[PDB]
Amino acid sequence: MSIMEQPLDLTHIVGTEVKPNTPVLMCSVPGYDASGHVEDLAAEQNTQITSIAIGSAEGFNQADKAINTAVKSGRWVMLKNVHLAPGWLMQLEKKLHSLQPHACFRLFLTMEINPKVPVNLLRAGRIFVFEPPPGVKANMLRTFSSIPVSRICKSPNERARLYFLLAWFHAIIQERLRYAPLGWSKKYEFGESDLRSACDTVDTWLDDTAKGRQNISPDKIPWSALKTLMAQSIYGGRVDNEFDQRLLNTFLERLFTTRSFDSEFKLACKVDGHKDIQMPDGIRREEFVQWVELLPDTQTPSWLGLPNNAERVLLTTQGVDMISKMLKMQ
Amino acid sequence: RDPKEWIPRPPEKYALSGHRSPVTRVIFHPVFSVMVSASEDATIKVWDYETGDFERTLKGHTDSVQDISFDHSGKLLASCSADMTIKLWDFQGFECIRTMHGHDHNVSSVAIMPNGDHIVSASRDKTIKMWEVQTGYCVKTFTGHREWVRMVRPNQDGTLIASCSNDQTVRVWVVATKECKAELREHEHVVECISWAPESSYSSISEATGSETKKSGKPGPFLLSGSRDKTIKMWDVSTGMCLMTLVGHDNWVRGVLFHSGGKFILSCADDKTLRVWDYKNKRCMKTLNAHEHFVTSLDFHKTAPYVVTGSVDQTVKVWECR
Amino acid sequence: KEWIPRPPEKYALSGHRSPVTRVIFHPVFSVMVSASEDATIKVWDYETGDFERTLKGHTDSVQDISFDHSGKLLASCSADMTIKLWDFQGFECIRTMHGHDHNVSSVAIMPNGDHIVSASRDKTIKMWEVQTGYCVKTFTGHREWVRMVRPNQDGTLIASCSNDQTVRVWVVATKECKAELREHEHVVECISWAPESSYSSISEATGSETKKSGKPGPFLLSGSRDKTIKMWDVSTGMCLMTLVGHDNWVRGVLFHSGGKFILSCADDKTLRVWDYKNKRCMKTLNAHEHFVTSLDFHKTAPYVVTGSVDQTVKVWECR
Amino acid sequence: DFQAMGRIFVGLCQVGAWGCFDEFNRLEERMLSAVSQQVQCIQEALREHSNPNYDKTSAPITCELLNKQVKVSPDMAIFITMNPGYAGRSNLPDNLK
Amino acid sequence: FNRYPLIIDPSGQATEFIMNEYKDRKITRTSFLDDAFRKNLESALRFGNPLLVQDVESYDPVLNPVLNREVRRTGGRVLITLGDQDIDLSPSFVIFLSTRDPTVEFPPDLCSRVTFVNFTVTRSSLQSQCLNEVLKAERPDVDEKRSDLLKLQGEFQLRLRQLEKSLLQALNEVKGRILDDDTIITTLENLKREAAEVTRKVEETDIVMQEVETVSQQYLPLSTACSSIYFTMESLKQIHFLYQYSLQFFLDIYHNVLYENPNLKGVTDHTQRLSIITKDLFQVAFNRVA
Amino acid sequence: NPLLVQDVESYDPVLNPVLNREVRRTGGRVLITLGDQDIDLSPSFVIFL
Amino acid sequence: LDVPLVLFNEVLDHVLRIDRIFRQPQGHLLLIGVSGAGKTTLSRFVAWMNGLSVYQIKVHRKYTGEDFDEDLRTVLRRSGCKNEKIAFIMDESNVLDSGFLERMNTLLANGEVPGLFEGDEYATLMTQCKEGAQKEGLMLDSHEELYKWFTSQVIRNLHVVFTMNPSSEGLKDRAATSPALFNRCVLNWFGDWSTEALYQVGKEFTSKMDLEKPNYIVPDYMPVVYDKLPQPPSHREAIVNSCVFVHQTLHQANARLAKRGGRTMAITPRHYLDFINHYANLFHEKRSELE
Amino acid sequence: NGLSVYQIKVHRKYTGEDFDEDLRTVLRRSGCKNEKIAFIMDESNVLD
Ligand SMILES: Nc1ncnc2c1ncn2[C@@H]1O[C@H](COP(=O)(O)OP(=O)(O)O)[C@@H](O)[C@H]1O
């Protein structure tokens, strides 16, 4: 089961394991979208793709024309939010069955996990589920895989450490959502857009403070600017509670500081009572991703700063649900 | 041989005669140097227009074949016949891959949309239907004509289809929304043939008609409609006005089209002659005694300097242009 | 051009209930016409091998059929002592010429398309008008049954082959036998002349010397039951070459449309195609399980058809 | 609907005016999804307008709105004002959010 | 069937079977989604041609008199009132309704008007298919031999049945008594001798089929595991509506683990290859499903 | 269905297209327009007055 | 209609009930029962007996409200202007919209739809009504009394037959969506074929088959399914009882399959008819082949 | 000549009102729709 802890490899699956006649259904839980992943996949595979948002009659017209053109020209087609048109989804599934498209043709149907999606379309295509990554390790691996290597490795050597700290902060914040009353006060929409905005803020302010210099002093990094922005606009924008804002500020002052560049900095304290998470001493992307891969498989809410018993009831409930699921389809 | 000025000349190149019945229509292969002719003996013979050598016959229709057309790639041939059926031919293997029924009477025209994914046809039941190429399913039925619809022809981008009928009117439809954009009614008799104006002739038409340049930049689609009152009329689809009337045929006009260079109008009629019209001066330049009987259709090759005319005398002729 | 039939066949057309006597090609249409011994003439489509129709106006066995230059009429002869003119648009008999006593063997229409020539057992050749139907002049001189008669490319010269060992060439104008040839070992049965595409090809094949005018002159071909095919000169009357190698009786001879090879059938149950310029291509092709009766070569299409006694007509590709 | 949003967006882009769309979740979910495409095209046109290599002497930046090429002024902006607490209001698609 | 059948086949094999059975009768395949469905239906009714109609979930109520056989006999003709016009119903007409959705619901009247024929996949059929696939992938010579033997056994049983029927017919058709005409004795001797060599061919093909069965016993657990895995896949829809997996998905998984397996590059031992195939089958099934 | 019609002295002028055989071929083999309805004529039909 | 029908007591009672209403003014039927039970066939047969003209709307995929309105105009013009007795047999599956139910409610209750005829249609209807009144012998000139006469003629002539399956929630919904469907219509509960009806159908259909076994031994514990089965049953009676048990077995099988959560297809009397037809054909074929 | 042929269908019940209706149809077609009509009628069609 270790293969599913790694980020999804869309390139290989799309290239080999998916036939052109089979649509790529990409279901996502609310708060997640697969449009960006496919756009990035088309960008790296230098393949032209047509993206159409379903919901209008002329939208269906452009969808039909794009599919008709792409089945012959071998291009890619995106149809987002197809769960809003179940009848048109059935018509599209019927159309796709009697079709002999080009070898390089691919159809991506971006929808959320909704019970109104036709069963025949689900059986016709290959389903991919996008959802919060299971662990902090998996979340940080996904964050490092999504960000391009050339983006992290810029002229300042401290950019990699800032990106690693931002990835750890994103993993900690997003994983605390699994415990709705304890981790936060409500299910906030901390997603990929916030991470991209934070990365852009890091890049902009690091470029502003460092005029192309190879190295910068840790105290010259605009810690106040990044902390204030990520507490007010990027991550604090969705927060509507004063105590949730206080928790976010506490995390920001704990992580984004000049002490984070020290060798003995502690990302987490007393996770198992004795051992604590230690700040990696690397200065490049490769060292940080190796450290992320070397994280222990065992994970507890004490990694997020929560009490270790915060997941006991949740784990018991999931065990009971697993037993019920196994008993239901014997 | 000016690359956009050649006109056919009275010395014919070849006079191919293999049909047992009057030739209905003749077309050119868009890619290969091959020519296809349909006749009333339920056969679709295929000729080579460089060497004038018969190649093969495409049979399978029960009754007389009335129209044939190619897609943009030339890989598919769509033919309609009097047996109410439309057949799609795989021109690579020369086999009928799909037979489409649904018209209630004789089908007198057929055409493949420029996108190549749909087939439009007109029949005697006063309807125009649209068929999918992949599935063969009828998806639309353009109704509104009061009589036998003789021809249907899409424009360059495929958004508009024009049709002519025995009701003495020419109608322009919108493919996307099925509405009748315009109903061109000025002919005094039944309209036989229609043809769209290529984009290369828009400036020539605008300057010949004296039409002032529109601020949009598009002069608007122009349509021609040969009819049985021995006249050819050029229309402006956007405004619905007849730009000019071409007079000079001695009988019913059977075919009309532009020179690929967009400088002349080529038309054939039942007066046994093929005429070249100078719409710049609204006069006829050259008249060719094409055949010994009625001339049913003509085609003009897009690039090569060659004109083909079918006729009721069961002979298909190829004309060198100089 | 260099077309040569191949051992594989395309269709084996079997609709006749009596041995097939002659098969011809329509001049313009993709139509094959076969005449058999059941007093019926059948029409086929050689491209797809589909039976089209039958012409059952004749009483006795139909012997020979011939089209005109336009292919608009079909002249047929039979053993019932009559010649029937068929209108190919309506496929109905339109004129039945009588006389010309006893079994009529051959019939042909000159390229003029106004007169017809026929041969029979009564040792004479008659000349008919297609428009009216009156025998205006009767040709005499053959002392036995005349088998086949063939005109020229412009309706002036006629040769007739007969059991009397003579292949004698005749003229429309003066009605005189300009050339008389009696030199075959046994009975001559089939004749066919040379198209203009092969006049030049004879010069290097035989070494014949051109006359003052420079034209090689009309040529003659005649197959005889002595298993020999011999190609002659009409202008002079001397032998040019003898083709030997047919196992049994020869039945039909003609020239390739390109005028380069010799293609003929015989009662040897096989179709043999021969080269005369260089004696190179000696292909022997089994065609029918029983005796082979007649054959024809398409002017432009790469098709050849053979008629046999085994009740069948076969179509061969040319390659 | 989609057409009205497209026409309003064309007007805003040509004028260069800020568009504050209050109660934006009162639209249908399908209409919001469709409008996301126009919003994304406008945002991309604005983004390519801001790169240093662009020169005002060259062709003006245009975006595809309602099957037409419409000039996008750098001064325009799109703002949506919403109250997600009301039950029955539409949920914006993720690509729009 | 009495009522016109309605075929349910997600795999589409039954549709091809129907088209092959009625190919000689010029069967026409159409659909309810086609606008011109009326014209094909009328042509089939008039000319008595077999008709196969797909997408029955969009059933056209115009077929109600046809399905109900609401015919009106008058003057030797059988009239069916399709819509507003009368049509001479040829006795050779037959219509088959088909669909690819096993989970589609039908109104009770449609259920009453048709004979439901459900083409569901079974454990034995799936086991046989997987065993044949693995034999073809790993022992192509054995698979070819098995196919040849099945063809020969079919032909031999056909010959034996024909010989028995002909012998009975000949003994029934004698106009008198057997030894009166020697041709009867000739025919009986010929039929008996032919039965003799055909039977001998039966035993030899039987022993070769026995050795084929013995060599194929090693791959039976793999086929059983394949059937169990697929039927676990099919039952995954009970815990979540999104877990809809078709047979083609499992067939693709099996093809990938058989032919596109990177762990079979240098392995030649049959037992090692089978163990690797089983392990990677489980691994790939989990990887693709989850 | 061969038909016999008596009392021809009260002839109904509706058989005029039928009596004159004013049919058109193609598009359904034999087509007869009895009044305003395009009836397909059966070749086995025959009427006696 | 050339379709064979087997007659039992329930069919006679049902045709009598239908014939009673068809002879009453403004008599509408509400036939409720499983599909294939013969509701439409019995209604058509009774309408033919009483001279009524059976009218059914030819619904299709593209059928819409305007087509329903034009069909209603046609049937009302025939019933009122032409004085034609019409049995308007309409099924639940023919209702593609609530507008259909609104129009039907108004027509059953008042006998006329106020907004159905307008413009040119209204003038044509009025001219036809004047012609009909002249034919009947009444002198009417103004439009109001002409419309009143048309409404009276429609009430006297038009009969509407409603057929639908016994759905409890559907019945409750229709009790409010179409109030006149339960007040202006006589509700007849045909239901499914009972055990007695199935037994009679089996006995009548399998009468031609031999099914005779003189040495048949009656079991001590006879699985009696039909209550009125004779105590010393014969072989034929046992066979028909087995057929009835088979039908009930399918009913129970679908009940269990729906209970577990599976998808079920309803068994109709047409299934029983197919079963008995297959039994007869197989019996004849096997007997012939064996002999 | 492109004219549309119109022939009135008479029968035993053909009376004056039917001829008036046919005349109205012909006049409407030839005057309101600008349709050229060749109104062919025979003396046998003149019943009154
Ligand atoms: N009493 C009966 N005997 C034999 N067949 C019957 C009987 N009643 C109905 N049927 C069958 O039912 C079919 C018609 O059903 P129909 O009356 O339309 O169903 P519904 O009652 O749902 O409208 C006919 O084809 C007929 O074979």
Query: Chain B residue with minimal CA distance to F28?
Result: B105
**One-letter amino acid for residue C155 of the chain:** G
Task: Report A:95-134 residues touching B (Cβ under 8 A).
Answer: 98-100
Q: Tell me, what DSSP letter sits at residue G112?
A: S
Distance CA E234, CA F44 (A): 60
Is-contact B295 B307, C-beta < 8 A? no
Rg of the Cα atoms in chain H: 12
Treating both helix axes as pointing N-terminal to C-terminal, what angle do G269-290 and G195-205 enclose, rounded to 10 degrees? 30
Is the CB of E39 less than 8 angstroms away from the CB of B103?
Answer: yes
Residue G39 assigned as binding residue = yes
Residue G141: Cβ-neighbour burial (10 angstroms; 0-12, 13-18, 19+): exposed
Residue G43 assigned as binding residue = no
Q: Which of E2, E63, E67, E68 should be mutated for ligand 1, with most atoms under 8 A from CB?
A: E68
Instruction: Name all chains with 3 or more CB-CB pairs below 8 Å to chain B.
Output: A, C, E, F, H
CA distance readout (Å), A116 to A48, A88, A113: 31, 12, 9
The alpha carbon of E60 and the centre of ligand 1 are apart by a number of angstroms equal to 20
Distance CA E231, CA E242 (A): 16
**One-letter amino acid for residue C10 of the chain:** K
The alpha carbon of G178 and the centre of ligand 1 are apart by a number of angstroms equal to 27
> Which residue shows structure tokens 């429309």?
C172
Task: Tell which atom from ligand 1 comes closest to the C-alpha of G163.
Answer: 23
Is the CB of E35 less than 8 angstroms away from the CB of B101?
Answer: no
B60, containing H or E segment: none
Q: Tell me, what DSSP letter sits at residue G72?
A: H
Rg of the Cα atoms in chain G: 24
Distance CA C222, CA C228 (A): 9
Task: Tell which atom from ligand 1 comes closest to the C-alpha of E69.
Answer: 25
Contact status of G270 with chain E (Cβ, < 8 Å)? yes
- Do chain B and chain H touch with ≥3 beta carbon pairs under 8 Å? yes
Parallel, antiparallel or unpaired: strands C73-78 and C83-87: antiparallel
Question: Which residues in H lie closer than 8 A to residue B190 (C-beta atoms)?
Answer: 2
Q: Which residues of G240-257 are buried (b: 16+ CB within 10 A; e: fewer)?
A: bbebbbbbeebeeebeee
Distance from CA of F45 to the nearest CA of B (A): 22
The alpha carbon of E84 and the centre of ligand 1 are apart by a number of angstroms equal to 22
G245, containing H or E segment: helix G235-260
Cβ(G270) to ligand 1 under 6 A?
Answer: yes
* Lookup: tokens for B314: 């069961």
Cβ(G37) to ligand 1 under 6 A?
Answer: yes
Is-contact F40 F29, C-beta < 8 A? yes
Which residue from D30, D33, D94 is facing A31, i.e. has the nearest CB?
Answer: D94
Instruction: Name all chains with 3 or more CB-CB pairs below 8 Å to chain H.
Output: B, F
Q: In sequence order, which residues have a C-beta less than 8 Å from that of residue E54 and are 6 or more positions away?
A: E15, E29, E30, E31, E32, E98, E99, E100
Contact status of E76 with chain G (Cβ, < 8 Å)? no
Task: Report E:14-53 residues touching G (Cβ under 8 A).
Answer: 32
Nearest protein Cα to ligand 1, atom 9: G38
Instruction: Name all chains with 3 or more CB-CB pairs below 8 Å to chain A.
Output: B, D, E
**One-letter amino acid for residue G164 of the chain:** M
Q: Tell me, what DSSP letter sits at residue E107?
A: -
**One-letter amino acid for residue C243 of the chain:** L
The alpha carbon of G74 and the centre of ligand 1 are apart by a number of angstroms equal to 27
CB count within 10 Å of CB A263 equals 8
**One-letter amino acid for residue B240 of the chain:** G
Distance CA A79, CA C235 (A): 86
Is the CB of A59 less than 8 angstroms away from the CB of D34?
Answer: yes
Q: In sequence order, which residues have a C-beta less than 8 Å from that of residue G20 and are 6 or more positions away?
A: none
The alpha carbon of E153 and the centre of ligand 1 are apart by a number of angstroms equal to 47
Is-contact G239 G211, C-beta < 8 A? yes
Question: Which residues in E lie closer than 8 A to residue B140 (C-beta atoms)?
Answer: 35
Distance of CA H45 to the CA centre of its chain: 10
Distance CA E31, CA B137 (A): 8
Is the CB of F26 less than 8 angstroms away from the CB of B84?
Answer: no
| Sign of the alpha-carbon torsion through G54, G59, G65, G66 | negative
Contact status of A94 with chain E (Cβ, < 8 Å)? yes
Which residue from B18, B54, B59 is facing C48, i.e. has the nearest CB?
Answer: B59
Is-contact A303 A271, C-beta < 8 A? yes
Instruction: Name all chains with 3 or more CB-CB pairs below 8 Å to chain D.
Output: A
Distance CA B160, CA E243 (A): 45
Distance CA G248, CA G265 (A): 14
The alpha carbon of G205 and the centre of ligand 1 are apart by a number of angstroms equal to 15
Distance from CA of E232 to the nearest CA of A (A): 8
Cβ(G11) to ligand 1 under 6 A?
Answer: yes
Is the CB of G60 less than 8 angstroms away from the CB of E60?
Answer: yes
* Lookup: tokens for G112: 């006329």
Nearest protein Cα to ligand 1, atom 15: G36
Residue G224 assigned as binding residue = no
Task: Tell which atom from ligand 1 comes closest to the C-alpha of G190.
Answer: 21
C295 φ, ψ to 5°? -160, 165
Contact status of H1 with chain B (Cβ, < 8 Å)? yes
Q: Could you tell me where the DSSP H helices lie in E139-246? A: 140-172, 182-216, 220-234
Distance CA D73, CA D60 (A): 9
Q: In G69-221, which ranges are E strands? A: 86-91, 158-164, 185-189
Distance from CA of E239 to the nearest CA of A (A): 6
Residue contacts between B and C (CB atoms, under 8 Å)? 14
Cβ(G6) to ligand 1 under 6 A?
Answer: yes
Is-contact C72 C59, C-beta < 8 A? no
The per-residue DSSP string of B137-206 comes to -EEEEEE--SS-EEEEEE-SSSSEEEEEETTS-EEEEETTT--EEEEE---SS-EEEEEEPPGGGHHHHH
Cβ(G243) to ligand 1 under 6 A?
Answer: no
Q: Among residues B137, H13, C275, which one has the least CA distance to residue E29?
A: B137
Distance from CA of F40 to the nearest CA of B (A): 12
Is the CB of C30 less than 8 angstroms away from the CB of B59?
Answer: no
Cβ(G94) to ligand 1 under 6 A?
Answer: no
- Do chain D and chain E touch with ≥3 beta carbon pairs under 8 Å? no
The per-residue DSSP string of A270-317 comes to -SSSS---B-----SHHHHHHHHHTS-S---GGGGTS-GGGGHHHHHH
Q: Report the SS3 class of residue D78.
A: strand
Cβ(G3) to ligand 1 under 6 A?
Answer: yes
Query: Chain B residue with minimal CA distance to E35?
Result: B138
* Lookup: tokens for E33: 């989604």
3-class secondary structure per residue, D10-33: HHHHHHCCEEEEECHHHCCHHHHH
Distance CA E72, CA E64 (A): 15
Query: Chain G residue with minimal CA distance to E117?
Result: G265
Nearest protein Cα to ligand 1, atom 19: G36
Cβ(G40) to ligand 1 under 6 A?
Answer: yes
Question: Which residues in D lie closer than 8 A to residue A28 (C-beta atoms)?
Answer: 94
Nearest protein Cα to ligand 1, atom 18: G40
Nearest protein Cα to ligand 1, atom 6: G5
